[PDB]
Coordinates of C-alpha atoms and ligand atoms in Angstrom, one line a residue:
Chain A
X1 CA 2.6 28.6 11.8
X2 CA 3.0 25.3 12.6
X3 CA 6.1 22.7 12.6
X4 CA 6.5 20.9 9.2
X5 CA 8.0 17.8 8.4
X6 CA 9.1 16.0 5.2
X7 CA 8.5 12.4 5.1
X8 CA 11.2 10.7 2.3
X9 CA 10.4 7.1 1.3
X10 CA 11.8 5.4 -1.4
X11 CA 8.4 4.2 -2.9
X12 CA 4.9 3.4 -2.0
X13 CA 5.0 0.1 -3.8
X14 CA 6.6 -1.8 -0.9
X15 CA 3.4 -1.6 1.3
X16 CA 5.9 -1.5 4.3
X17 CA 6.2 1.8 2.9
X18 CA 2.8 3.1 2.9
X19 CA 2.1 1.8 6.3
X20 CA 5.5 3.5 7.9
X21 CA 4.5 6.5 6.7
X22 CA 0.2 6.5 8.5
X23 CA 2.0 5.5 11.4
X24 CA 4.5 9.0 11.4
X25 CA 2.0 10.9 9.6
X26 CA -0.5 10.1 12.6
X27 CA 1.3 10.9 15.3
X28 CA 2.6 14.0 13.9
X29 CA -1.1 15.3 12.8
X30 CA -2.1 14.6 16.7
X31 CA 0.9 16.8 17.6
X32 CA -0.4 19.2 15.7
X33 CA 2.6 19.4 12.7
X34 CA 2.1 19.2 9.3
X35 CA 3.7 16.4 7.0
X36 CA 4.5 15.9 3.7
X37 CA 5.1 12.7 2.1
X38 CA 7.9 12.6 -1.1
X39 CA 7.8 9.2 -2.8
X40 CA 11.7 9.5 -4.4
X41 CA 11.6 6.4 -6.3
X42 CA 10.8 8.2 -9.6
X43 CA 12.9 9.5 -12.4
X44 CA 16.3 8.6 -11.1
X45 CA 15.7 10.8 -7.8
X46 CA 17.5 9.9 -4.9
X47 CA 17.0 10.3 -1.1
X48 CA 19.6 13.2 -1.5
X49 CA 16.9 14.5 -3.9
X50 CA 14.0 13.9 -1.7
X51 CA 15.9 16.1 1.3
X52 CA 16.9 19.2 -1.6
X53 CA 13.0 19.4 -2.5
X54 CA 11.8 19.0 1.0
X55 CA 14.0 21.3 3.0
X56 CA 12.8 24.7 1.9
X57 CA 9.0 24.0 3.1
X58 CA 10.2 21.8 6.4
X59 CA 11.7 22.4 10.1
X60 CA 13.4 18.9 9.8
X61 CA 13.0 15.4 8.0
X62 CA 12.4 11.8 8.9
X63 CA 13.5 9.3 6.1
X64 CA 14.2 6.2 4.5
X65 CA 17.4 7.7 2.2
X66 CA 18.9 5.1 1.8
X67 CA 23.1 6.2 2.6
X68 CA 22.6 9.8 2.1
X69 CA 22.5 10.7 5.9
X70 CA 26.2 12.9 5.3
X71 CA 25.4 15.2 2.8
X72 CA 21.1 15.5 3.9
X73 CA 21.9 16.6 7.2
X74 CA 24.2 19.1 5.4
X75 CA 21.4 20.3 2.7
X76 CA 19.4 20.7 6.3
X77 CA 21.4 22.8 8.2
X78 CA 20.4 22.9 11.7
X79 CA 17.2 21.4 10.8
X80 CA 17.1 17.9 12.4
X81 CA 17.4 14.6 10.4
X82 CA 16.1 11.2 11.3
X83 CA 17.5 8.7 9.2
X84 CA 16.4 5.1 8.9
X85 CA 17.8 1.8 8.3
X86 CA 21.5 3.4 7.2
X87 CA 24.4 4.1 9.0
X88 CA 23.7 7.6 11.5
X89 CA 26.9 9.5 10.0
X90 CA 26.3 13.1 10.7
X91 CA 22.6 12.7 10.3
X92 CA 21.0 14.7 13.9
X93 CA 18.9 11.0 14.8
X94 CA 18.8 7.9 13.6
X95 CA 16.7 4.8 13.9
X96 CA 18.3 1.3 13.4
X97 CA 17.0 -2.6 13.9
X98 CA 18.4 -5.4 15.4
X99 CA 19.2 -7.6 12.3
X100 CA 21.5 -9.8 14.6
X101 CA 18.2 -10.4 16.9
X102 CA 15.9 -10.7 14.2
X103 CA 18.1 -13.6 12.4
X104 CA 18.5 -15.7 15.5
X105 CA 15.0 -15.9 16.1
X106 CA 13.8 -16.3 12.7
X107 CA 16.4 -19.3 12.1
X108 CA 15.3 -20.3 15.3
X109 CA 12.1 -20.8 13.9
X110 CA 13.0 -23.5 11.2
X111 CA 15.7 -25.2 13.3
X112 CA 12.3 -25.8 15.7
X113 CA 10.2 -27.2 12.8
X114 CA 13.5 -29.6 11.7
X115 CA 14.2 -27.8 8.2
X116 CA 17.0 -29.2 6.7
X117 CA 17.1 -27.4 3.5
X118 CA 16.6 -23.7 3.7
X119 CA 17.1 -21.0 1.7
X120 CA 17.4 -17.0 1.9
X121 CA 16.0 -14.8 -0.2
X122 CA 18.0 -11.8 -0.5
X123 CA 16.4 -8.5 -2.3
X124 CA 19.3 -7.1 -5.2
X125 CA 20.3 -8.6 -8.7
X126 CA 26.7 -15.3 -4.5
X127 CA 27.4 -13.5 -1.4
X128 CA 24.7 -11.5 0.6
X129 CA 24.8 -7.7 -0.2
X130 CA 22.5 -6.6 2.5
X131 CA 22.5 -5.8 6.5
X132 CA 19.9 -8.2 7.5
X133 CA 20.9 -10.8 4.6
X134 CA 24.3 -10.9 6.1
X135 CA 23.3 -11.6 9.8
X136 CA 20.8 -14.7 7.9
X137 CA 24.1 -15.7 6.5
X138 CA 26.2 -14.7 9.6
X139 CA 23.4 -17.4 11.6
X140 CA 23.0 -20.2 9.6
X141 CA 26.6 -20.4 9.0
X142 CA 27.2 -20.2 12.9
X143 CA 25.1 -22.8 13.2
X144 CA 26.0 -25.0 10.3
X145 CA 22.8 -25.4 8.3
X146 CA 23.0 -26.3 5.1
X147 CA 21.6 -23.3 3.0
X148 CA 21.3 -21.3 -0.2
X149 CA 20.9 -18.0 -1.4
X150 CA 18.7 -16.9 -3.8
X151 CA 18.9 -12.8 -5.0
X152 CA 15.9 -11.8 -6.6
X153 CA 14.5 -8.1 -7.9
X154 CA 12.5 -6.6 -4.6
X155 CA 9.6 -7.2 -5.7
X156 CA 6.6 -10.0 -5.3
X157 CA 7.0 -10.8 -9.0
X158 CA 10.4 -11.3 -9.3
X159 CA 10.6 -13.4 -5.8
X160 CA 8.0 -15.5 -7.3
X161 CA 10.0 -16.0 -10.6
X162 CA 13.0 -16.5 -8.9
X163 CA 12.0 -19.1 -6.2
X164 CA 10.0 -20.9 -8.9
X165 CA 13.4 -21.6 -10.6
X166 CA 15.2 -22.8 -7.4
X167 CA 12.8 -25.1 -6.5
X168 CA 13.4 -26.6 -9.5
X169 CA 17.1 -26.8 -8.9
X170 CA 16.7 -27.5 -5.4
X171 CA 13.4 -29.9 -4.7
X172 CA 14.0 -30.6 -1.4
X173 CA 14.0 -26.8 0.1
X174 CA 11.6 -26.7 2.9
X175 CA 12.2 -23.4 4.8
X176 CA 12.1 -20.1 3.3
X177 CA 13.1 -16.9 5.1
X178 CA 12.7 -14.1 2.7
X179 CA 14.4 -10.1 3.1
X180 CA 10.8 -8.8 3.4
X181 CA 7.2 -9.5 3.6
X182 CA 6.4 -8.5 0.0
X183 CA 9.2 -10.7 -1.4
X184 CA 7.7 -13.5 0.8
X185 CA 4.2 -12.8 -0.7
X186 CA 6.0 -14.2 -4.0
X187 CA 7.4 -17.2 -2.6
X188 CA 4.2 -18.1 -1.3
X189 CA 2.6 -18.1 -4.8
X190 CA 5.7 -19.9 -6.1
X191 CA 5.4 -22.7 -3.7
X192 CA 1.4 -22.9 -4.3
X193 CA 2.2 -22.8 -7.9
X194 CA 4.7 -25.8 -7.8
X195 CA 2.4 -28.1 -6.0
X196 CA 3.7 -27.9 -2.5
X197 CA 1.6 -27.5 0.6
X198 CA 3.0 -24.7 3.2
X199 CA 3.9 -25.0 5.8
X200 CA 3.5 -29.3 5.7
X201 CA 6.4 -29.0 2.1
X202 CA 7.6 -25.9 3.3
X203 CA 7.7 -23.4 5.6
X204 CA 7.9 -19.2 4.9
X205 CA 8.9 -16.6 7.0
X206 CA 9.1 -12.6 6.1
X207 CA 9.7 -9.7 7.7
X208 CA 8.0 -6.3 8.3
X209 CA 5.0 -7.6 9.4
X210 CA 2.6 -5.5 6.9
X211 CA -1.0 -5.7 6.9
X212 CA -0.9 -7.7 3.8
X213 CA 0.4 -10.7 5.3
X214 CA -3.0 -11.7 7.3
X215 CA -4.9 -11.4 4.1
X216 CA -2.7 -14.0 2.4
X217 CA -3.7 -17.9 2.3
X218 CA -1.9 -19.0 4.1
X219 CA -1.6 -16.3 6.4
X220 CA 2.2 -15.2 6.7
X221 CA 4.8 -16.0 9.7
X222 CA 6.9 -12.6 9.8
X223 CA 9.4 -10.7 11.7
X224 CA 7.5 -7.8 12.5
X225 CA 7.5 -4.6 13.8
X226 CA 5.3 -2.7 15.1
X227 CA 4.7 0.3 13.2
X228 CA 3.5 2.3 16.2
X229 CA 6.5 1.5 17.8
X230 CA 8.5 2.8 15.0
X231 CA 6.4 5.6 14.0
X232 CA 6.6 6.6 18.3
X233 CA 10.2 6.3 18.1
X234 CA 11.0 8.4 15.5
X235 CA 8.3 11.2 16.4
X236 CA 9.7 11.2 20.0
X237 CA 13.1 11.6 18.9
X238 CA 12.4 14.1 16.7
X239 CA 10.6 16.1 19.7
X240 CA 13.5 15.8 21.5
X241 CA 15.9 17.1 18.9
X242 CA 13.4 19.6 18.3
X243 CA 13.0 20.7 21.9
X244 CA 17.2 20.3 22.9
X245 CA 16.6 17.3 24.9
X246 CA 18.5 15.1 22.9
X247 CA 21.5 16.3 21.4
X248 CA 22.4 15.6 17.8
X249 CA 24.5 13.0 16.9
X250 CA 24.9 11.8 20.5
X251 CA 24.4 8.1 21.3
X252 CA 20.9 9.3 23.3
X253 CA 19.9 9.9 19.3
X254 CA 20.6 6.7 17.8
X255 CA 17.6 4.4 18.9
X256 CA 17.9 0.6 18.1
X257 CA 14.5 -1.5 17.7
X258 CA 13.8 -5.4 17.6
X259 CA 11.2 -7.0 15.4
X260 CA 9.4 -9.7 16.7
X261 CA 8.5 -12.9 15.7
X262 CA 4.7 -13.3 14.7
X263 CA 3.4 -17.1 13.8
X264 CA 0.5 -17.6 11.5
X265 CA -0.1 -20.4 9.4
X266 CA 3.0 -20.3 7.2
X267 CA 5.3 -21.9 9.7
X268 CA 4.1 -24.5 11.9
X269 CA 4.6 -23.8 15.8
Chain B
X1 CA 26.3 27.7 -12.9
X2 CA 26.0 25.2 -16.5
X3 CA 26.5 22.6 -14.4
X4 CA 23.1 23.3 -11.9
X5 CA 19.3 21.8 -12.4
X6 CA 18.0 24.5 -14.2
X7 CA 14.2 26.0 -14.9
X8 CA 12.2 26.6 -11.5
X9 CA 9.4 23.7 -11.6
X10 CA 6.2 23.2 -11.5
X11 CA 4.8 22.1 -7.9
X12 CA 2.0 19.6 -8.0
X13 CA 0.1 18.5 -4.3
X14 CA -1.7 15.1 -4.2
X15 CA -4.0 14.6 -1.4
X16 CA -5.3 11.1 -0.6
X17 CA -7.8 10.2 2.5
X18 CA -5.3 7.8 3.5
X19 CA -2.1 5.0 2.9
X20 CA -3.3 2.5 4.7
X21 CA -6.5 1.2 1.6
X22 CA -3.9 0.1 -0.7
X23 CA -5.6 1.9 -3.8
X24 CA -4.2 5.1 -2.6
X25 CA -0.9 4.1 -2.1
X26 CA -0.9 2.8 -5.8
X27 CA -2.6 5.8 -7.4
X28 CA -0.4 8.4 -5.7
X29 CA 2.9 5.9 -6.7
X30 CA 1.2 6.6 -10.4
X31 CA 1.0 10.0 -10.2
X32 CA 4.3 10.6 -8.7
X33 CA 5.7 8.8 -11.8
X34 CA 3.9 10.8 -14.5
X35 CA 4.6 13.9 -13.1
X36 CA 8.2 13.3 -12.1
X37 CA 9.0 12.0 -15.3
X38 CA 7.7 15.6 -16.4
X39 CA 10.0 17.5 -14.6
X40 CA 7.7 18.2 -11.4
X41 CA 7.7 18.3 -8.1
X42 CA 5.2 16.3 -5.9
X43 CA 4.4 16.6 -2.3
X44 CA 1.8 13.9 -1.1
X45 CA -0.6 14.9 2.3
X46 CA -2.1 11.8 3.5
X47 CA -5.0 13.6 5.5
X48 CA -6.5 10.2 7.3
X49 CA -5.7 11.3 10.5
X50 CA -6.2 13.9 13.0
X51 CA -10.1 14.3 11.9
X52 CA -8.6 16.3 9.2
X53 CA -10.8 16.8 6.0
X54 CA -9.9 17.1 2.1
X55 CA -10.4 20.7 2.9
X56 CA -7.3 20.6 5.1
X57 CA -5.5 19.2 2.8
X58 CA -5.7 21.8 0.2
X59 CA -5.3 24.3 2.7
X60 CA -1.9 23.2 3.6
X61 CA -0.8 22.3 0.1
X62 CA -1.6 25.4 -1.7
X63 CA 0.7 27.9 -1.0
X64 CA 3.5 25.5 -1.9
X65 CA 2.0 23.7 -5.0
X66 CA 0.9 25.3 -8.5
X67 CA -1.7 22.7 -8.5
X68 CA -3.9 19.8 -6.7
X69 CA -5.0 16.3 -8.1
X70 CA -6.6 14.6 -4.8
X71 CA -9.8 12.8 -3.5
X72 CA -11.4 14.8 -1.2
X73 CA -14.0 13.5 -0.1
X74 CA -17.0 16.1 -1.0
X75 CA -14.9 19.2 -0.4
X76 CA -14.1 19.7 -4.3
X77 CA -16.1 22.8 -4.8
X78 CA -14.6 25.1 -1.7
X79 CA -11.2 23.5 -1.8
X80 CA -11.1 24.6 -5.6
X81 CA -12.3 28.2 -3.6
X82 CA -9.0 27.7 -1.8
X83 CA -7.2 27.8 -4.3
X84 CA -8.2 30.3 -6.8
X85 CA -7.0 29.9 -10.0
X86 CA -4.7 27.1 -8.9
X87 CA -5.9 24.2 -10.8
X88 CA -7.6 21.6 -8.7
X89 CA -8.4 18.0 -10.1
X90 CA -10.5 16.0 -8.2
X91 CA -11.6 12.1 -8.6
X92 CA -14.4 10.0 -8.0
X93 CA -17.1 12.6 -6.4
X94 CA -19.3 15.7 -7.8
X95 CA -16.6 18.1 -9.0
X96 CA -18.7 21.9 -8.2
X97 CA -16.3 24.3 -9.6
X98 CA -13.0 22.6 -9.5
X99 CA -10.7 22.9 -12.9
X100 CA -10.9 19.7 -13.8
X101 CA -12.3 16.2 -12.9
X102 CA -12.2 12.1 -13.3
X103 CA -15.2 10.0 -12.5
X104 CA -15.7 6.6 -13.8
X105 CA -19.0 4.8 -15.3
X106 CA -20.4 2.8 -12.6
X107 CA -23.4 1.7 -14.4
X108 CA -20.9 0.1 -17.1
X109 CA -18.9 -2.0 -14.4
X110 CA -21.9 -2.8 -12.6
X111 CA -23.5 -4.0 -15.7
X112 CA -19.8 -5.8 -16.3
X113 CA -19.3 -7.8 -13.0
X114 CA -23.3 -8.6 -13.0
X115 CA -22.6 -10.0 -16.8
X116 CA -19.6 -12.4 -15.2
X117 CA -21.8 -13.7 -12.1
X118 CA -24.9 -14.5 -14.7
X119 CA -22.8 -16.1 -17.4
X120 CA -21.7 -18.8 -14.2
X121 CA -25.0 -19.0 -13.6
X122 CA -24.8 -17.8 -9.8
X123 CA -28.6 -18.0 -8.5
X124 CA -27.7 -16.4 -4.7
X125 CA -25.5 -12.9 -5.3
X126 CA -24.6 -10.6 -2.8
X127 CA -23.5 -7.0 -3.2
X128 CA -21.2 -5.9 0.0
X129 CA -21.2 -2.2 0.9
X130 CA -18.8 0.1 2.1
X131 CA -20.5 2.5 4.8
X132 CA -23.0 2.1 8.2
X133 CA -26.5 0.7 8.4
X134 CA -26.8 2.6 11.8
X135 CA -29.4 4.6 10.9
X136 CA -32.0 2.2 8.9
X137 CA -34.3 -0.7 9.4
X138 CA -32.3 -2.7 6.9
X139 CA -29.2 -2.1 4.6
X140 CA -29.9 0.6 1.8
X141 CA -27.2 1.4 -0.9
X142 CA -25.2 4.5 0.2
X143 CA -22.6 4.9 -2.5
X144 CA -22.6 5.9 -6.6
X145 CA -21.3 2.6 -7.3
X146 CA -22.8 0.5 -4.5
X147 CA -26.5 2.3 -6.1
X148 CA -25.3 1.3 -9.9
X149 CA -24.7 -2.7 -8.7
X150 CA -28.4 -2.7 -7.0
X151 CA -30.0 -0.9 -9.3
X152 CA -28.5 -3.6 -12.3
X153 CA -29.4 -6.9 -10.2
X154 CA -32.9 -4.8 -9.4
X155 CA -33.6 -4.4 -13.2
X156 CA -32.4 -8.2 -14.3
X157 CA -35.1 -9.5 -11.3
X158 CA -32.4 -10.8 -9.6
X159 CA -32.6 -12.0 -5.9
X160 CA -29.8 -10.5 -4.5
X161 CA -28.8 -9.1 -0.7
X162 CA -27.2 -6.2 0.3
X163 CA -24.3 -6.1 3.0
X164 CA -22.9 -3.3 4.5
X165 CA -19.7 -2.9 6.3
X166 CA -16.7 -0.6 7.1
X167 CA -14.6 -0.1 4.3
X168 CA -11.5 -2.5 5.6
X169 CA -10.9 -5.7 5.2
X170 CA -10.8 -7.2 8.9
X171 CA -14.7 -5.1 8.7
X172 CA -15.7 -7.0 5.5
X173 CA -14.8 -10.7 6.6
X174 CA -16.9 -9.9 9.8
X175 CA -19.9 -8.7 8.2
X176 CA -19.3 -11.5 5.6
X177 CA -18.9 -14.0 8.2
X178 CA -22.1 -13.1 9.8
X179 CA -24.2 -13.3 6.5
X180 CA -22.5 -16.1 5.3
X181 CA -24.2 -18.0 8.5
X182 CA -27.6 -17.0 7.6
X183 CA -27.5 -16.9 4.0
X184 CA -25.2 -20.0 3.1
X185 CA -26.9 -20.8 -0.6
X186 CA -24.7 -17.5 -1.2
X187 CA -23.0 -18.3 -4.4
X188 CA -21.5 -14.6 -5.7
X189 CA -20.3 -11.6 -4.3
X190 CA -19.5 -8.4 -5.5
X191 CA -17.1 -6.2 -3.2
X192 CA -17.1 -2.6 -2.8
X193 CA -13.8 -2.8 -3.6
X194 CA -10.5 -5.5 -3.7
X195 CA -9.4 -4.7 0.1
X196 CA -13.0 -5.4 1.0
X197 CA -12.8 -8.6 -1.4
X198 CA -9.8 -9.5 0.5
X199 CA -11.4 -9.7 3.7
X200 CA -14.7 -11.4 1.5
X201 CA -12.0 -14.2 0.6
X202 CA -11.1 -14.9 4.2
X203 CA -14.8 -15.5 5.4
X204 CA -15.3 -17.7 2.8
X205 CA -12.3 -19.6 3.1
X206 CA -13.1 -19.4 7.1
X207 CA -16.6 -21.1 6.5
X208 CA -15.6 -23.8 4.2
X209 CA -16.6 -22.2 1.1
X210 CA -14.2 -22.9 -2.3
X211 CA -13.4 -20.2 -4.1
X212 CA -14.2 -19.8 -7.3
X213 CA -16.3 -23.5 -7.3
X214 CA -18.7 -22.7 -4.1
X215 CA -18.7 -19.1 -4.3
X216 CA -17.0 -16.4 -6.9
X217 CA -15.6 -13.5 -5.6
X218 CA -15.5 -10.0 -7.8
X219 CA -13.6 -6.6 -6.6
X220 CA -12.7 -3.4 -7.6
X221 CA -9.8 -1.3 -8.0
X222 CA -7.0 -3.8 -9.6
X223 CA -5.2 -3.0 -6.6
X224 CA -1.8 -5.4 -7.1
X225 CA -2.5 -7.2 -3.7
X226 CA -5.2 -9.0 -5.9
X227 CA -2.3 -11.0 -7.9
X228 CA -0.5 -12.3 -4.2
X229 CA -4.2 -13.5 -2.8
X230 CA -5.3 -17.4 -3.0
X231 CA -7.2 -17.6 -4.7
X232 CA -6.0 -14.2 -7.1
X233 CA -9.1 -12.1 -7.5
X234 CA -10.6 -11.2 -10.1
X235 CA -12.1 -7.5 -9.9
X236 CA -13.3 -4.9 -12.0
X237 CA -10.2 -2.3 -12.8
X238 CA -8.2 0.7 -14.6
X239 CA -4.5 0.0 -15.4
X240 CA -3.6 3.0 -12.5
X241 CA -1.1 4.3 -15.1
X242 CA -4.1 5.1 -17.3
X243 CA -6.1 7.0 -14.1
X244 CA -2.6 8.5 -13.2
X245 CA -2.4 9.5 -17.1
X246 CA -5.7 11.0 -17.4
X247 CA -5.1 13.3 -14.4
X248 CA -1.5 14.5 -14.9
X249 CA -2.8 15.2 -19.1
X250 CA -5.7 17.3 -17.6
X251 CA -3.3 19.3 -15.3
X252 CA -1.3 19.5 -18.3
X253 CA -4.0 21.1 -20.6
X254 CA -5.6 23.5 -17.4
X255 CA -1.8 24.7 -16.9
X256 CA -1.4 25.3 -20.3
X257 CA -4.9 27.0 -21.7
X258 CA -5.7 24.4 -23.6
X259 CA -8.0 23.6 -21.6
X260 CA -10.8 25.6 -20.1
X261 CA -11.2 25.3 -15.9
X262 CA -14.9 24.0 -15.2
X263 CA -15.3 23.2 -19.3
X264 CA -16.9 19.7 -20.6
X265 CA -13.6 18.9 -21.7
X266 CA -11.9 19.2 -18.2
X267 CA -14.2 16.3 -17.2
X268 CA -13.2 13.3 -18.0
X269 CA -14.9 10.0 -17.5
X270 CA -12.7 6.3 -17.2
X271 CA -14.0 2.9 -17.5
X272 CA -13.1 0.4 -15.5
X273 CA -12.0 -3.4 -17.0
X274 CA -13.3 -7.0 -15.9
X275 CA -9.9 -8.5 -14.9
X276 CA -10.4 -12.1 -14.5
X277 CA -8.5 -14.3 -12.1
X278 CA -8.9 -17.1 -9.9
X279 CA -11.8 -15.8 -7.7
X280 CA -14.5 -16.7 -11.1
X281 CA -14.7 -19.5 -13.5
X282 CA -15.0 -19.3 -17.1
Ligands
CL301 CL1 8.1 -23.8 10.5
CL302 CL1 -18.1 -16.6 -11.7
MG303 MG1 -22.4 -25.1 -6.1

């Protein structure tokens, strides 16, 4: 019988999703392991949820739960858990990013190109709520900018909607960094929609670094990581919890990664 | 012990070929939906890798699913073998034996997108395949649906080519590219499908070609990457809730007797929609 992992993501509409998942599934079907995928963002279900169906039919877990690390790596026993983007807590492994990293650069990217009106779009329903919108925030506040938050629905649709109605408010906005690549996507057709020429009227820049984002006109700037990267990181940890290499909980099983900044024709540099 | 989840659930296995052609990725979401909002369990095995088969994926589901919905890629008849009396529905290929099954008309989409490129009057159409020419002295249609477009621009005398290319979107705006070059009257292409279109988009953009005005652009699938592209691309589609519907109500009807494994009724035959965007006029 072979080793058998359960893969919990919180959809499969968020093509980040989709293509973090290939990448895991790969490397564990080369190992030889089985995966299975559960797409908890259904009916209410949680990532708590997703670990309760998975654990009877899997030797450990890698997942998106989104805070449930506590009580999952409970439900698992001495099965290991990999948790992503969330606090470790008593979770056995956890894999992290480097928001602080990823906001300098990005900002970096729109002081370069002289944007004087920027704004963030953060993914929720005043203040940023997330991680990565808070080291944005944490940046451009550091460095003075004058800047604007804009909350939207995660999806493309409700980016869109909601960019379309601060630009406006707000004519002059010519950089956008948006909480993720799919959200950008909707910016993009916002700004398209409104007249303005990108990145000449304004510049946009995502993160994730999906596939989707070459296929775009223009082509999307992104923070991006790479998948096999992340995909590696959390199959190698896994092996190592697995195997008693690593030992749960201990700092050798919290892995940080950085994205990295990839130019197309969205920004100019 | 009135406070617990209560009923032990039906267990349902999806099996797609892989996450990374955005259809799949939308389908399954579909299907996890229906069946969730039924009470079910789903466990999705994304067999694109490892040289594994659709064979393999049914082999690993079964003994922890009641049931199978999946494309399989021509292995419908044994992996319904597999699993016994364990319902299997299949999509999109010859169903053998399997419990239940969805195709879709091609000759009515084919006869659909045709209609939209004739009414816009485009003299120079090309049809772009998903598959390999490897083996042929020219390009040949290899697929149902790829077959259905050919033979409608055959029948209306149309002069038409055929391109053939991988089925990604980096593979279709190479091949496109290339023909583009030789054959630049080209005023209308239809896509294998919208990831293909994508990457049909991107040549044409590459080569100086407007979109709709020089060239339209048709796909299939009504994948929702089709409403982000510029220009938005207009394609020949199914609402996936209706696809995902018409597969979790078969399961349904197998699970419950009311309907008969391998019966007429357990086949079940969609229709796709013209969607139009940006990517056409008129
Ligand atoms: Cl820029
Ligand atoms: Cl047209
Ligand atoms: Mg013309």
């Amino acid at each position: 019988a072979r080793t058998s992992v359960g893969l919990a993501i919180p959809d499969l509409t968020n093509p980040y999703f989709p293509a973090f998942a290939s990448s895991v599934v790969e490397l564990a079907t080369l190992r030889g392991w089985h995966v299975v995928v559960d797409d908890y963002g259904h009916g209410g279900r949680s990532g708590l949820d997703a670990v309760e169906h998975l654990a009877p039919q899997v030797d450990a877990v890698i997942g998106y739960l989104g805070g449930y690390a506590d009580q999952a790596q409970t439900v698992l026993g001495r099965r290991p858990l990999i948790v992503l983007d969330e606090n470790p807590g008593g979770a056995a492994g956890s894999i992290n990013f480097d928001y602080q990293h990823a906001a300098k650069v990005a900002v970096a990217q729109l002081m370069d190109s002289k944007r004087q009106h920027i704004a963030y779009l953060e993914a929720g329903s005043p203040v940023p709520c997330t991680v990565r919108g808070k080291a944005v925030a944490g940046r451009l506040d550091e460095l003075g900018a004058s800047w604007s938050l804009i909350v939207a629905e995660e999806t493309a649709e409700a980016a869109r909607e909601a960019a379309a109605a601060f630009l406006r408010e707000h004519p002059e906005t010519d950089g956008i960094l948006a909480f993720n690549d799919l959200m950008a996507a909707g910016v993009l057709k916002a700004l398209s929609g409104s007249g303005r020429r990108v990145p000449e009227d304004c510049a946009v820049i995502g993160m994730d670094g999906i596939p989707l984002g070459e296929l775009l006109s223009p082509q999307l700037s992104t923070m991006a990581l790479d998948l096999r990267e992340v995909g590696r990181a959390a199959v190698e940890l896994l092996v190592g919890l697995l195997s008693g290499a690593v030992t749960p909980g201990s700092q050798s099983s919290r892995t940080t990664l950085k994205h990295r900044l990839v130019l197309r024709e969205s920004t100019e540099g």
